[PDB]
Amino acid sequence: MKQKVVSIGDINVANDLPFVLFGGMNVLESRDLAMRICEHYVTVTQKLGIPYVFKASFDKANRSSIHSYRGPGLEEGMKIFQELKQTFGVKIITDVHEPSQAQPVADVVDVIQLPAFLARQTDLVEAMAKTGAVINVKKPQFVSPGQMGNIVDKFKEGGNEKVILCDRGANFGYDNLVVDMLGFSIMKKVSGNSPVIFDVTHALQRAQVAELARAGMAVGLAGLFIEAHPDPSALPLAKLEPFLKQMKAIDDLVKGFEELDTSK
Amino acid sequence: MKQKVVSIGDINVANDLPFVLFGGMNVLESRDLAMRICEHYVTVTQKLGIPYVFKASFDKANRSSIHSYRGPGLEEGMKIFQELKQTFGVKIITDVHEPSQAQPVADVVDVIQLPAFLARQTDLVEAMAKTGAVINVKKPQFVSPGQMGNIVDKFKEGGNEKVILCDRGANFGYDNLVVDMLGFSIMKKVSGNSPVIFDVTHALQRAQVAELARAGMAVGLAGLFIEAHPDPEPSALPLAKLEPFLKQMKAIDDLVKGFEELDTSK
Amino acid sequence: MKQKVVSIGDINVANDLPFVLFGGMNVLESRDLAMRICEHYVTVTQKLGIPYVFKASFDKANRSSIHSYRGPGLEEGMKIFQELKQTFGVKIITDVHEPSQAQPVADVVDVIQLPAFLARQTDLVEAMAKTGAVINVKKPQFVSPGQMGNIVDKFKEGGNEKVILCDRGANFGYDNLVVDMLGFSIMKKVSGNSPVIFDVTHALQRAQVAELARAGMAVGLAGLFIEAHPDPEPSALPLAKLEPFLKQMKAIDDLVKGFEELDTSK
Amino acid sequence: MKQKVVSIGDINVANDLPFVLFGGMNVLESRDLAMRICEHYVTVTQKLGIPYVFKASFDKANRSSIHSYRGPGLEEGMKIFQELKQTFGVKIITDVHEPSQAQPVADVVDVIQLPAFLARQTDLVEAMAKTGAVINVKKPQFVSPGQMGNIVDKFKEGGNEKVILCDRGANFGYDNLVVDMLGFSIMKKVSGNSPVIFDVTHALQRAQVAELARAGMAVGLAGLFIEAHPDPEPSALPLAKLEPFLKQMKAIDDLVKGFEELDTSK
């Protein structure tokens, strides 16, 4: 069966298409860092020729203290995304933490994503499906890949079929994650060949980003979620280019192989 | 350090006190079902002499289908709760899912619960803590017992020191839970010896509910959390077996709680 | 189906019989230490009415370096066991690691133990089985409880139906073990109800020995496996704490074995 | 530090060298099938320029039943390997299961393999080490990658520094294996950069040998281990697909090995 294609503007995400890079930073901690980081991404994607989408969060709804920096907020944040939309013309992506935010954000941004922990809360879901916008579902660390279909079905019944499944690792004992490279195809098959991407940045939680990422891309994915930072979990900003080069070389190579049926 | 006593009216919850039963049903299906389930917990706990708090959700915030049944809602649910208090005089525990529900629910209820999935959502914790109500934290299947101090602290900074921690199992590979009996103490240690209880019915994988519950109770806990149903077709104890089940629990609890202090470190 | 009974001289091991204690020390460090430890176990179990089998390893065949202390070796180790038998009349359990050790060791001890890592080695199982001795199988940390029936079948194939199954924890991520209290019944179920014991000392990947041991005993087991040491410097129980520890175990076992059947599945 | 190089005849194995293929069949079922499968591996690797070592077992030491087919055994097995050497000039790798088997097997074979369940048995390691042969260690499903250093050190104390490390999965809950792609570097790091290969066929939990193999190969490894069979009916690549499969592996390896150095740490 054909691979499902989900379009984010002029960009086309699908499992058998050049991978798409949903990359950016953790949180919009400043308009200067957001501007700075965003630019570096666009010029490199530009140069390398990789479908791109800027990603950043306007709020960290799950930090360990009520008094520890939360972020820009919904209002000030959409402003920063607006002048990024204007300055660089980049497609945007960010996570929503409550139904009430599904619409405000939905217009200002191109892709809204369902946090892992809140990935089963039906209300947040329906408000997102309502929106009709492109959605990035972050697979919970605690749910099997063979379960992702149901979340896809929930959005369908909620009137939205612009869903992208992002693996972000699986629980492996206490305080630790492992990435099941075989999960991708399972999410793939249980969701009408929906497009699957891979958030290497969170599945780590450094020296291994490269290895983890190559491994995933080698499997054959629709995209790659990632975060960077000039002075850092995140990829040092400067290395974004060699990184993507490797990533694109592997993607082009794997997307090029002809079908290989190892079942028989 | 002595054990932390969290009070629910005249009921005291603590790791070295007789266990408290946080028991009920999954969701407030009908007034009749809630009345029948509540009634049986009430007479059985009275007969056995076990402190009791009735549980039921007014809303199922995460069922697989957008259209599947999800309870009477906040409004009707609170009414059913007031009626249960008018009829039985029972303490009540229910879980909240949005910051706004925290206060109206605490106005009716005796213990508000923090769903496992939203255990790290600081806005809910904030709102819940602000009510000053006794809190029951469902430990995520995905966080280690050692990480529970932060949540208890988050409530502390929010003005609330009436937090009870509840184990409900831990992820073990794909779609499977295992209960780490060693985690109870860790949660005690990392939280000023806050009361620790065990949700045997969600941690379940059944004729195994008793074995897991016995194991948990033998460790020595502040309480037990379980759901039951007259006819079980998220697992439930059959209502009619409540009594012989609790008989085993109380016997194990009284025995273990009466044990002379024992340190095996040295 | 009736519980399977495995006997060791005047002792009988079964899931519905008072628990049997397979206790001792890790390795036969010195005959003096073995004597001292063994005397204390006999006195205490004798005084409490607990069936007892003394355990110690003559060799630690799977350490880190080729030079780490491995014990006194087979020959010298048998010497010590003999002296322990003559001096105290104790039954003995020890592990064997190669096919050619099974018979010489069975000639001296009452129970031969199949190490966890070697539980699937066909030649070792057959040599052990032909011996006709009582067998204690350490369940592999990496095999699910539902898989233990095959090991019992293999032993029967080799003429031996005196197999005891012993849980010693399951892999939980890296370098960690968790004890699945629900695994005890599964092992029972897939093995024709073979006796199931719990090795609490190796399950502790501690001041948590009593807690984990209580949890397991409360499930209702055929026995307990434990190691102790005068000065603990894997995680041994302090020798002087043996008595208070066993009073808890017997108390929990008598209570639990004393309960009437309770089916919570219906 | 430089990558450690282990040589096998006119072959060199190292993490920064083109990958080596340790491939063949599971057990030496018959002389005919062994011939047929070896022929095809040689033909295909010869054509693609992939260093190659033929794999097959002379004994399956850990099947479910004592009576099920184990293979031809050590004597008959070495004879078959001999014919392979003479007929095809291939290098050979096989596993050994008892200490006494190491020497006579290393006298015929080029690489001896230490089974995962036995990787920590000191006497087997010592006997294998003393033969002076090239060693392939199957990493236990139950040992963390960071623990592979001790195994390598044990071989060294035994006078053997020709050790290759083979990942074959990590236990993930019950009856499941997950491959940790981050483990390869850990193994590399704690073992003085010993060569690291990947057994994709035993790491399969069906028809996705290709993507698991690709992912591992993309990490950058010293080699790949695989089994195949004319009719597959753990897993086993279908023979006829060997070429297309190896073609992708060689393509990814050349690409990745060709990359400049990328430090994502700063």
Tab-separated table of C-alpha atoms in Angstrom, chain C residues 113-212:
chain	number	residue	atom	x	y	z
C	113	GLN	CA	21.670	-26.486	42.155
C	114	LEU	CA	21.533	-25.436	38.471
C	115	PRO	CA	22.965	-21.869	38.125
C	116	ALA	CA	20.785	-19.273	36.389
C	117	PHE	CA	23.169	-18.688	33.474
C	118	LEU	CA	23.443	-22.413	32.806
C	119	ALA	CA	19.760	-23.358	33.123
C	120	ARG	CA	19.482	-24.247	29.454
C	121	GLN	CA	22.693	-26.233	28.980
C	122	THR	CA	21.392	-29.661	28.003
C	123	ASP	CA	24.439	-31.673	28.981
C	124	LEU	CA	24.526	-30.147	32.459
C	125	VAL	CA	20.809	-30.790	33.001
C	126	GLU	CA	21.117	-34.389	31.928
C	127	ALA	CA	24.157	-35.136	34.069
C	128	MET	CA	22.375	-33.542	37.055
C	129	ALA	CA	19.139	-35.415	36.365
C	130	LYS	CA	20.790	-38.877	36.055
C	131	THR	CA	22.213	-38.244	39.464
C	132	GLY	CA	18.798	-38.784	40.978
C	133	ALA	CA	19.413	-35.910	43.425
C	134	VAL	CA	16.918	-33.212	44.351
C	135	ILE	CA	17.275	-30.262	41.995
C	136	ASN	CA	17.027	-26.521	42.653
C	137	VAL	CA	16.785	-24.575	39.402
C	138	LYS	CA	17.745	-20.886	39.595
C	139	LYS	CA	15.371	-19.158	37.169
C	140	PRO	CA	17.407	-17.160	34.567
C	141	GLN	CA	17.032	-13.380	35.026
C	142	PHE	CA	16.427	-13.370	31.262
C	143	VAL	CA	13.710	-15.997	30.920
C	144	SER	CA	10.029	-15.352	31.603
C	145	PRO	CA	8.397	-17.427	34.395
C	146	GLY	CA	6.129	-18.976	31.768
C	147	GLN	CA	9.171	-20.720	30.337
C	148	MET	CA	10.149	-22.805	33.354
C	149	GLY	CA	8.043	-25.823	32.414
C	150	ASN	CA	10.513	-26.717	29.691
C	151	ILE	CA	13.353	-27.017	32.164
C	152	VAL	CA	11.276	-29.272	34.380
C	153	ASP	CA	10.336	-31.388	31.329
C	154	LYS	CA	13.977	-31.727	30.375
C	155	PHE	CA	14.864	-33.029	33.837
C	156	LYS	CA	12.003	-35.511	33.661
C	157	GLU	CA	13.321	-36.592	30.267
C	158	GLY	CA	16.536	-37.423	32.074
C	159	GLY	CA	14.703	-39.399	34.752
C	160	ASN	CA	14.514	-36.719	37.443
C	161	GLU	CA	11.223	-35.451	38.874
C	162	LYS	CA	12.567	-33.904	42.077
C	163	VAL	CA	12.819	-30.329	40.758
C	164	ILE	CA	12.401	-27.148	42.802
C	165	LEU	CA	12.098	-23.834	40.895
C	166	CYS	CA	13.765	-20.759	42.448
C	167	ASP	CA	13.071	-17.153	41.448
C	168	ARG	CA	16.002	-14.750	41.717
C	169	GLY	CA	14.656	-11.655	39.949
C	170	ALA	CA	14.276	-10.510	36.337
C	171	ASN	CA	16.323	-8.049	34.261
C	172	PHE	CA	14.972	-4.544	34.571
C	173	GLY	CA	16.822	-2.336	32.103
C	174	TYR	CA	20.618	-2.468	32.551
C	175	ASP	CA	22.348	-3.694	35.723
C	176	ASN	CA	19.108	-3.948	37.613
C	177	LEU	CA	16.662	-6.573	38.754
C	178	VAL	CA	13.045	-6.386	39.724
C	179	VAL	CA	11.079	-9.208	41.361
C	180	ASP	CA	7.748	-9.920	39.669
C	181	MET	CA	5.508	-11.212	42.495
C	182	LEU	CA	3.088	-12.552	39.843
C	183	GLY	CA	5.729	-14.783	38.420
C	184	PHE	CA	5.552	-17.312	41.274
C	185	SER	CA	2.131	-18.609	40.221
C	186	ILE	CA	2.959	-18.682	36.504
C	187	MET	CA	6.006	-20.847	37.262
C	188	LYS	CA	3.769	-23.055	39.432
C	189	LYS	CA	1.189	-23.274	36.652
C	190	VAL	CA	3.526	-24.195	33.789
C	191	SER	CA	5.488	-26.727	35.803
C	192	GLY	CA	2.838	-29.145	37.037
C	193	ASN	CA	2.813	-27.124	40.282
C	194	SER	CA	6.492	-27.787	41.099
C	195	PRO	CA	7.616	-26.217	44.357
C	196	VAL	CA	8.556	-22.546	44.008
C	197	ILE	CA	11.059	-20.828	46.265
C	198	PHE	CA	12.427	-17.273	46.274
C	199	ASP	CA	16.093	-16.308	46.486
C	200	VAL	CA	15.784	-12.933	48.159
C	201	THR	CA	19.524	-12.257	48.478
C	202	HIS	CA	20.264	-12.326	44.722
C	203	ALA	CA	17.029	-10.557	43.833
C	204	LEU	CA	18.579	-7.579	45.591
C	205	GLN	CA	20.579	-6.869	42.408
C	206	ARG	CA	20.435	-4.313	52.183
C	207	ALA	CA	17.980	-2.881	54.699
C	208	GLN	CA	15.405	-4.075	52.180
C	209	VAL	CA	15.961	-7.834	52.655
C	210	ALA	CA	13.120	-8.156	55.174
C	211	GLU	CA	10.716	-6.170	53.007
C	212	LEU	CA	11.278	-8.114	49.818
